[PDB]
Amino acid sequence: AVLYQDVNCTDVPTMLHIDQVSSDWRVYAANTGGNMFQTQAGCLVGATYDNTSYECDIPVGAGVCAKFQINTGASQSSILAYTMSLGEDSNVAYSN
Amino acid sequence: NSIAIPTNFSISVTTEVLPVSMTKTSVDCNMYICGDSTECSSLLLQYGSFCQQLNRALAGVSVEQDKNTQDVFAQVKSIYKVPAIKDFGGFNFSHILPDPAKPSKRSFIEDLLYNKVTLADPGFMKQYGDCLGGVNARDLICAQKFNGLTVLPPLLTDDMIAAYTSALVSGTALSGYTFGAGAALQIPFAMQMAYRFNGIGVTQNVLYENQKQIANQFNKAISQIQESLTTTATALGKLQDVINQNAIALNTLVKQLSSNFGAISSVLNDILSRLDPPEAEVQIDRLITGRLQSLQTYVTQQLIRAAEIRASANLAATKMSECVLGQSKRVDFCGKGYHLMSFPQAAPHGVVFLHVTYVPSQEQNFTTAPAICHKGKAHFPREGVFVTNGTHWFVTQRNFYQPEVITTENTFESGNCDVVIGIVNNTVYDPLQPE
Amino acid sequence: FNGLTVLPPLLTDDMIAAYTSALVSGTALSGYTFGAGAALQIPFAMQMAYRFNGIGVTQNVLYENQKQIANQFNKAISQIQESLTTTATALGKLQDV
Amino acid sequence: RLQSLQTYVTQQLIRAAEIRASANLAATKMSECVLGQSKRVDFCGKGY
Amino acid sequence: NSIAIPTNFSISVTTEVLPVSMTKTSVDCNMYICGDSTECSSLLLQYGS
Amino acid sequence: INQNAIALNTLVKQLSSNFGAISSVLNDILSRLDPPEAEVQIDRLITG
Ligand SMILES: *[C@@H]1O[C@H](CO)[C@@H](O[C@@H]2O[C@H](CO)[C@@H](O[C@@H]3O[C@H](CO[C@H]4O[C@H](CO)[C@@H](O)[C@H](O)[C@@H]4O)[C@@H](O)[C@H](O[C@H]4O[C@H](CO)[C@@H](O)[C@H](O)[C@@H]4O)[C@@H]3O)[C@H](O)[C@H]2NC(C)=O)[C@H](O)[C@H]1NC(C)=O
Ligand SMILES: *[C@@H]1O[C@H](CO)[C@@H](O[C@@H]2O[C@H](CO)[C@@H](O[C@@H]3O[C@H](CO)[C@@H](O)[C@H](O)[C@@H]3O)[C@H](O)[C@H]2NC(C)=O)[C@H](O)[C@H]1NC(C)=O
Ligand SMILES: *[C@@H]1O[C@H](CO)[C@@H](O[C@@H]2O[C@H](CO)[C@@H](O[C@@H]3O[C@H](CO)[C@@H](O)[C@H](O)[C@@H]3O)[C@H](O)[C@H]2NC(C)=O)[C@H](O)[C@H]1NC(C)=O
Ligand SMILES: *[C@@H]1O[C@H](CO)[C@@H](O[C@@H]2O[C@H](CO)[C@@H](O)[C@H](O)[C@H]2NC(C)=O)[C@H](O)[C@H]1NC(C)=O
Ligand SMILES: *[C@@H]1O[C@H](CO)[C@@H](O[C@@H]2O[C@H](CO)[C@@H](O)[C@H](O)[C@H]2NC(C)=O)[C@H](O)[C@H]1NC(C)=O
Ligand SMILES: *[C@@H]1O[C@H](CO)[C@@H](O[C@@H]2O[C@H](CO)[C@@H](O)[C@H](O)[C@H]2NC(C)=O)[C@H](O)[C@H]1NC(C)=O
Ligand SMILES: *[C@@H]1O[C@H](CO)[C@@H](O)[C@H](O)[C@H]1NC(C)=O
Ligand SMILES: *[C@@H]1O[C@H](CO)[C@@H](O)[C@H](O)[C@H]1NC(C)=O
């Protein structure tokens, strides 16, 4: 997964120089199938975003972390992006 | 033969600031040295491997800063919901907890702390049009990026850091310090504050007699903290100093390229435009050596500063663990006087501690004696000393004045009345009076 | 002759010793109450009694053997000077730096 | 000569950091041992 | 089933030494390098900051 | 342990670089050049 730091991925074609790179980077320069999502530090390319929150494994920055999934039923072998979880929530109330 | 015993007390709140972390940076050799030059890139490759060490050191520094921040702030893995009411037995917890009126996720004091100290360049979201690709006045930040110098954002955002402080402050008002050693234990704040007075050698009854005065003094001190912060601009100095040091180091590293050392010109394009490669290699070599020396000096200074910040962060984490999640009897470790409780507040690249202490005042003059002789036997006090008015005798505390009659359960009996010096005639109350 | 100079410290030797004199004198008059606020006068015999109380020993033992404790304290203080005179390795870190 | 000066400055900085740590420890010991009584083991000598 | 209890005490005084500070120094480049030489001073100025 | 080993290995392997000279090996430099010309080649290696 390639993270283009300090750029808006709406303007990748005017930054990555698509016309002067190999087709492999042309794959990582197009917004198809939700492969580009804007984060606080940059815009990650080549990974899928997920809801909820898990413990951080691969630090990225600005509260975003990454992990690799090995799925056989869904045939998923990509990288996930998510927001780290602060911790579990308690329900202690005040009484006099 | 005299002794001074205080008769009044006051509640004082003090502040303390400790840096926790600094900025994270990265350096690219192929861009800082030999900018857009294939021949110079080949020469640098021929020079040797003198750049992997710099990248490894910078990565280690960044990881160390992230670890320091996590260790200082993230200590308890339990988020406690902020109570709806912010008045616990007269104590006003309004300027320490976030206001639900606006979802700012920060307290009133933290906003002032953030606005008091400025930052060089936040966001790290500068694109073309915001640099010389568009229009600028040649800002420093775009000049740094033109030579491979970049600044990485921290792993934890400002909102996430304030969540830890909100959880820590809320947990104290609901359990005290029992949640630090295990699970939370609910307790009324009035009873919780009573045992804080018990740990400093003062009896529990004094708090219930003057609860309103204590609450008023606490609220007044909390309110005056904001006024003191507003009226001054020198308390938050360390964070500004470290930010300025990092900015100055980066700017000096950027501007060091103007020097040509022993060559004929600082620019590399003109050297290759007028000299053959056999003669241009000598000119390029000295520039390469000088730039590598400057990079090495910068890396060494950054490593030293990182070590200092690591020591400061370790001290801050120890103070947070031993002063917020418990009560410490160490002298001058949690302020001036007798420590009662502490409140953590988030600061940019640092942390602010609010220490609540107990300070006696309004001394009074009294006389004292070592022991008391009742009948051929000496009696020694258990908790306190002997005081005297107008040919009388009483037993009282030291941190507070509260005379009581001398009884057999307040003094243990040991020895005779001859070895002890200063002992005087006195009677002892007999418990068997109504019999 | 080569631009190398050494600057004197801000605080002189006499001023530094004043702090030590104030600290030692304050202990003999108030113990440690002056560190947390204002000074509190107290007899030294009673002040030393509660020092024995903080280490789990009862207060009565000090008054029974005050003379022995004072003699031992004076002997140790006197022997400190002899030990310092007879040796020359205790003050090593300052010489090293 | 510039290299020698840089080496001297770096060594002085390291020694200054070490002296700073030692001075912090000494100040903490002075605060916790002279202006009060400490129950920490082997922090103010041998014994109680 | 046994226990040892001391019956006497002694007062001992020990010493401890901690460094607090070191000497302060200053360095002049124009004197240490290029001592009394205008040409060398100009070359050092050209060298950089 | 890994940091110390890596530092030692990097220090050992740093000798392969010839800096601005013509060869990393010192035997061949003295085998083809006069001392007046070989001193310049040796100086940069020594400094590096
Ligand atoms: C140092 O501080 C102590 C604090 O206790 C003072 O000691 C008390 O001093 C007061 C004032 O002199 C004494 O009060 C007097 O006591 C008598 C009544 O005692 C009754 O109650 C006790 C039990 O508490 C019984 O043992 C006793 O038998 C009685 O039943 C009377 O002499 C006095 O009454 C006068 O005042 C009242 C109220 O104003 C009037 O209604 C009466 O008409 C009359 O005028 C008075 O109440 C008290 O006994 C002392 N306590 C002790 C333990 O001795 C010291 O005086 C003070 N020293 C100085 C120099 O200030
Ligand atoms: C010594 O401690 C006592 C309490 O044990 C203090 O006495 C009371 O202190 C409170 C402090 O708020 C005073 O309240 C104030 O009183 C007036 C009322 O007109 C006014 O200034 C304020 O609105 C407030 O209510 C209270 O009056 C006072 N009581 C007496 C009898 O004086 C005392 O102040 C302490 N001493 C010192 C020097 O602080
Ligand atoms: C155990 O503690 C007791 C006291 O609780 C010590 O007993 C007394 O110790 C003092 C120490 O100064 C002795 O004083 C000396 O005695 C003679 C007098 O001729 C002389 O050596 C000195 O001039 C000094 O005055 C005192 O005699 C002694 N009492 C007895 C009955 O022995 C005791 O010494 C302690 N034990 C040890 C082993 O130290
Ligand atoms: C990246 O581009 C996107 C798409 O243009 C921007 O999204 C909006 O940008 C406008 C104009 O700045 C803002 O007012 C809106 O709030 C943005 N969001 C939405 C949902 O409309 C985005 O801001 C751009 N990022 C940067 C840093 O310029
Ligand atoms: C503890 O809190 C409860 C509420 O959780 C208080 O109960 C109130 O008591 C007053 C007494 O005048 C009633 O008028 C209210 O209707 C009660 N409920 C509420 C929601 O306020 C209780 O009084 C508190 N205890 C103390 C000692 O203050
Ligand atoms: C403390 O009280 C005792 C017991 O009464 C006093 O000892 C006696 O004092 C009387 C006078 O009150 C003398 O006549 C006796 O000879 C004393 N007996 C002795 C010394 O065995 C003792 O003096 C009192 N202490 C004082 C007044 O400081
Ligand atoms: C994931 O979150 C998005 C954004 O709120 C939401 O639209 C989507 O339904 C969620 N998917 C789930 C909960 O499976
Ligand atoms: C206490 O009273 C005594 C009586 O002799 C006097 O000398 C002393 O100065 C007084 N102390 C204070 C602090 O007023």
Side-chain angles (χ1 to χ4, degrees):
Chain A
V2 175
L3 186 146
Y4 295 105
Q5 180 191 357
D6 191 46
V7 69
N8 210 3
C9 54
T10 304
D11 298 352
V12 166
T14 187
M15 179 68 62
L16 194 57
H17 297 344
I18 298 183
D19 57 354
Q20 290 179 358
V21 295
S22 179
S23 300
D24 299 324
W25 289 79
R26 265 77 169 271
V27 176
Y28 292 90
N31 182 21
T32 54
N35 50 13
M36 291 159 56
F37 50 94
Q38 179 61 46
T39 64
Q40 296 294 334
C43 187
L44 190 58
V45 179
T48 65
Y49 185 78
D50 199 330
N51 288 348
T52 70
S53 296
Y54 297 94
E55 68 282 347
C56 186
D57 179 70
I58 303 175
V60 168
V64 185
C65 298
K67 62 182 301 180
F68 179 78
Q69 60 187 355
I70 175 65
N71 295 121
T72 307
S75 69
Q76 303 302 317
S77 178
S78 59
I79 316 295
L80 303 92
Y82 57 92
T83 304
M84 65 171 66
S85 62
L86 278 297
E88 60 272 20
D89 191 9
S90 182
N91 49 9
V92 178
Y94 178 78
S95 59
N96 63 64
Chain B
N1 49 14
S2 68
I3 182 65
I5 294 93
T7 58
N8 225 323
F9 57 91
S10 60
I11 302 298
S12 61
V13 174
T14 60
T15 178
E16 183 172 292
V17 181
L18 289 87
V20 174
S21 63
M22 64 181 186
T23 62
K24 311 180 302 179
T25 176
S26 181
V27 176
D28 197 328
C29 288
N30 197 25
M31 195 169 181
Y32 176 73
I33 311 178
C34 307
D36 292 328
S37 180
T38 60
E39 303 85 3
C40 200
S41 299
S42 59
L43 262 58
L44 180 58
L45 185 143
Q46 181 266 356
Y47 184 89
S49 173
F50 261 80
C51 283
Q52 286 74 10
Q53 304 178 350
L54 318 178
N55 293 330
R56 292 207 309 263
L58 293 183
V61 166
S62 303
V63 174
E64 188 178 17
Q65 299 303 323
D66 274 330
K67 180 180 178 58
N68 289 336
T69 300
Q70 186 171 357
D71 287 358
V72 166
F73 272 99
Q75 286 188 358
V76 58
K77 296 301 178 183
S78 294
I79 301 301
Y80 296 100
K81 279 292 172 293
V82 182
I85 188 60
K86 298 179 179 59
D87 199 319
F88 309 95
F91 292 81
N92 189 26
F93 281 3
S94 182
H95 290 170
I96 320 296
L97 293 175
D99 201 330
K102 195 266 179 181
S104 59
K105 279 81 62 180
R106 289 200 295 259
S107 68
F108 195 88
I109 300 183
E110 296 192 46
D111 289 333
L112 299 180
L113 290 176
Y114 278 14
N115 285 15
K116 192 56 174 299
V117 59
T118 59
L119 287 83
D121 283 313
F124 307 141
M125 204 57 181
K126 184 163 299 299
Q127 301 182 250
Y128 272 54
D130 294 330
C131 285
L132 271 297
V135 171
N136 275 326
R138 308 206 309 219
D139 312 334
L140 276 299
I141 182 65
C142 294
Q144 297 173 1
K145 293 186 177 299
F146 281 158
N147 301 121
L149 276 71
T150 54
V151 179
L152 302 179
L155 178 59
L156 294 183
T157 63
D158 292 354
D159 295 330
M160 297 178 58
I161 292 183
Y164 282 114
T165 63
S166 177
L168 284 174
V169 174
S170 59
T172 300
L174 269 63
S175 303
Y177 54 87
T178 58
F179 68 98
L185 297 176
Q186 54 179 3
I187 188 167
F189 193 82
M191 301 177 58
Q192 167 192 344
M193 195 65 177
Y195 277 18
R196 310 263 185 172
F197 270 67
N198 189 27
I200 65 180
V202 190
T203 53
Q204 186 181 346
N205 54 6
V206 69
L207 192 142
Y208 301 97
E209 296 287 334
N210 305 120
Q211 176 176 338
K212 303 298 297 300
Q213 181 192 23
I214 294 178
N216 285 327
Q217 291 180 2
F218 179 83
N219 296 13
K220 183 59 180 300
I222 291 301
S223 299
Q224 192 185 353
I225 282 297
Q226 168 186 348
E227 181 70 22
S228 177
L229 179 63
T230 304
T231 49
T232 197
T234 61
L236 282 79
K238 304 177 178 59
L239 320 174
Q240 187 69 25
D241 287 332
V242 301
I243 290 178
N244 294 332
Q245 286 303 306
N246 295 131
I248 286 303
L250 278 182
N251 292 14
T252 304
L253 184 62
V254 166
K255 289 191 298 297
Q256 200 57 47
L257 291 177
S258 299
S259 64
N260 49 17
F261 305 131
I264 57 181
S265 180
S266 300
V267 187
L268 190 144
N269 293 328
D270 60 353
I271 296 182
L272 300 180
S273 177
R274 59 184 292 184
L275 291 174
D276 285 329
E279 192 64 29
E281 286 152 359
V282 185
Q283 311 293 284
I284 295 178
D285 192 15
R286 50 194 66 182
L287 299 178
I288 291 184
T289 55
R291 294 174 180 177
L292 285 171
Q293 182 70 23
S294 58
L295 283 179
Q296 270 283 132
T297 298
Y298 171 76
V299 170
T300 301
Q301 289 189 354
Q302 285 304 117
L303 282 177
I304 297 182
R305 297 180 184 273
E308 194 273 340
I309 292 298
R310 171 68 178 180
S312 179
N314 284 129
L315 174 59
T318 298
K319 186 172 300 296
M320 162 84 70
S321 179
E322 291 205 5
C323 201
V324 176
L325 300 181
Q327 190 177 19
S328 179
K329 300 184 181 303
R330 304 172 64 181
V331 184
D332 292 0
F333 189 78
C334 290
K336 298 294 297 181
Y338 305 95
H339 166 243
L340 292 176
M341 53 199 308
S342 299
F343 298 137
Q345 295 298 280
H349 294 166
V351 67
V352 179
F353 284 102
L354 300 183
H355 297 294
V356 181
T357 55
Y358 179 94
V359 176
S361 62
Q362 197 172 340
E363 310 170 354
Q364 283 195 1
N365 208 5
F366 290 104
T367 175
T368 178
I372 293 300
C373 186
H374 185 72
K375 39 166 66 65
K377 307 297 295 301
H379 297 68
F380 298 93
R382 293 177 181 179
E383 298 279 357
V385 295
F386 304 109
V387 292
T388 286
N389 76 339
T391 71
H392 269 155
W393 289 91
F394 298 95
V395 179
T396 182
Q397 320 175 55
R398 286 196 167 189
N399 305 329
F400 201 81
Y401 187 67
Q402 187 179 353
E404 284 187 350
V405 293
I406 306 178
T407 56
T408 190
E409 62 271 10
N410 299 15
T411 55
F412 58 97
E413 194 184 79
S414 296
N416 296 334
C417 306
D418 50 354
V419 61
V420 185
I421 49 181
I423 198 164
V424 294
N425 283 178
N426 188 79
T427 177
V428 181
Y429 180 84
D430 190 15
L432 301 182
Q433 286 296 144
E435 281 73 14
Chain C
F1 281 158
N2 301 121
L4 276 71
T5 54
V6 179
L7 302 179
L10 178 59
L11 294 183
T12 63
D13 292 354
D14 295 330
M15 297 178 58
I16 292 183
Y19 282 114
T20 63
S21 177
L23 284 174
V24 174
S25 59
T27 300
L29 269 63
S30 303
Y32 54 87
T33 58
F34 68 98
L40 297 176
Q41 54 179 3
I42 188 167
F44 193 82
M46 301 177 58
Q47 167 192 344
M48 195 65 177
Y50 277 18
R51 310 263 185 172
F52 270 67
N53 189 27
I55 65 180
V57 190
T58 53
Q59 186 181 346
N60 54 6
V61 69
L62 192 142
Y63 301 97
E64 296 287 334
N65 305 120
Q66 176 176 338
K67 303 298 297 300
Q68 181 192 23
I69 294 178
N71 285 327
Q72 291 180 2
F73 179 83
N74 296 13
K75 183 59 180 300
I77 291 301
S78 299
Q79 192 185 353
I80 282 297
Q81 168 186 348
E82 181 70 22
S83 177
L84 179 63
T85 304
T86 49
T87 197
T89 61
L91 282 79
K93 304 177 178 59
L94 320 174
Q95 187 69 25
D96 287 332
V97 301
Chain D
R1 294 174 180 177
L2 285 171
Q3 182 70 23
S4 58
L5 283 179
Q6 270 283 132
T7 298
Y8 171 76
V9 170
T10 301
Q11 289 189 354
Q12 285 304 117
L13 282 177
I14 297 182
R15 297 180 184 273
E18 194 273 340
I19 292 298
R20 171 68 178 180
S22 179
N24 284 129
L25 174 59
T28 298
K29 186 172 300 296
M30 162 84 70
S31 179
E32 291 205 5
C33 201
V34 176
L35 300 181
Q37 190 177 19
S38 179
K39 300 184 181 303
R40 304 172 64 181
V41 184
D42 292 0
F43 189 78
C44 290
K46 298 294 297 181
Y48 305 95
Chain E
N1 49 14
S2 68
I3 182 65
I5 294 93
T7 58
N8 225 323
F9 57 91
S10 60
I11 302 298
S12 61
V13 174
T14 60
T15 178
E16 183 172 292
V17 181
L18 289 87
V20 174
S21 63
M22 64 181 186
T23 62
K24 311 180 302 179
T25 176
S26 181
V27 176
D28 197 328
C29 288
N30 197 25
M31 195 169 181
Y32 176 73
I33 311 178
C34 307
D36 292 328
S37 180
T38 60
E39 303 85 3
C40 200
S41 299
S42 59
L43 262 58
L44 180 58
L45 185 143
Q46 181 266 356
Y47 184 89
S49 173
Chain F
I1 290 178
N2 294 332
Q3 286 303 306
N4 295 131
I6 286 303
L8 278 182
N9 292 14
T10 304
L11 184 62
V12 166
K13 289 191 298 297
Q14 200 57 47
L15 291 177
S16 299
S17 64
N18 49 17
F19 305 131
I22 57 181
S23 180
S24 300
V25 187
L26 190 144
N27 293 328
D28 60 353
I29 296 182
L30 300 180
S31 177
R32 59 184 292 184
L33 291 174
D34 285 329
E37 192 64 29
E39 286 152 359
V40 185
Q41 311 293 284
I42 295 178
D43 192 15
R44 50 194 66 182
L45 299 178
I46 291 184
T47 55

